Curated annotation (Swiss-Prot):
Phosphorylated by SGK1 or PKA; which impairs interaction with SCNN. Interaction with YWHAH inhibits dephosphorylation. WW domains are involved in recognizing PPxY motifs in substrate proteins. The lineage of its organism: Eukaryota, Metazoa, Chordata, Craniata, Vertebrata. Residues 5-38 form the WW domain. E3 ubiquitin-protein ligase that mediates the polyubiquitination of lysine and cysteine residues on target proteins and is thereby implicated in the regulation of various signaling pathways including autophagy, innate immunity or DNA repair. Inhibits TGF-beta signaling by triggering SMAD2 and TGFBR1 ubiquitination and proteasome-dependent degradation. Downregulates autophagy and cell growth by ubiquitinating and reducing cellular ULK1 or ASCT2 levels. Coiled coil: none annotated. The chain holds residues 493 to 539 of 975 of the full protein. It is linked to Periventricular nodular heterotopia 7: A form of periventricular nodular heterotopia, a disorder resulting from a defect in the pattern of neuronal migration in which ectopic collections of neurons lie along the lateral ventricles of the brain or just beneath, contiguously or in isolated patches. PVNH7 is an autosomal dominant disease characterized by delayed psychomotor development, intellectual disability, and seizures in some patients. Additional features include cleft palate and toe syndactyly. Ubiquitously expressed, with highest levels in prostate, pancreas, and kidney. Expressed in melanocytes. It is found in: Cytoplasm; Golgi apparatus; Endosome, Multivesicular body. This is E3 ubiquitin-protein ligase NEDD4-like. The gene is NEDD4L. Interacts with UBE2E3. Interacts with NDFIP1; this interaction activates the E3 ubiquitin-protein ligase. Interacts with NDFIP2; this interaction activates the E3 ubiquitin-protein ligase. Interacts (via WW domains) with SCN1A. Interacts (via WW domains) with SCN2A. Interacts (via WW domains) with SCN3A. Interacts (via WW domains) with SCN5A. Interacts (via WW domains) with SCN8A. Interacts (via WW domains) with SCN9A. Interacts (via WW domains) with SCN10A. Interacts (via WW domains) with CLCN5. Interacts with SMAD2. Interacts with SMAD3. Interacts with SMAD6. Interacts with SMAD7. (Microbial infection) Interacts with Epstein-Barr virus LMP2A. Induction: By androgens in prostate, and by albumin in kidney.
Length: 47
């Protein structure tokens, strides 16, 4: 699919035992998988 693996500053790409790669941002302490829509601004437009 159109979901490419990239390594952005602060993020760390690892693999979860469930078989999905996850990105953990060491800046904001966040950890999630790269969702398609997550890559685009959703919360900062949905008001």
């Amino acid at each position: 699919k159109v979901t490419q693996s990239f390594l952005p500053p602060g993020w760390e790409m690892r693999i979860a035992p469930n078989g999905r790669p996850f990105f953990i941002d060491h800046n904001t302490k966040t950890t999630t998988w790269e969702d398609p829509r997550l890559k685009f601004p959703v919360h900062m437009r949905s008001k």
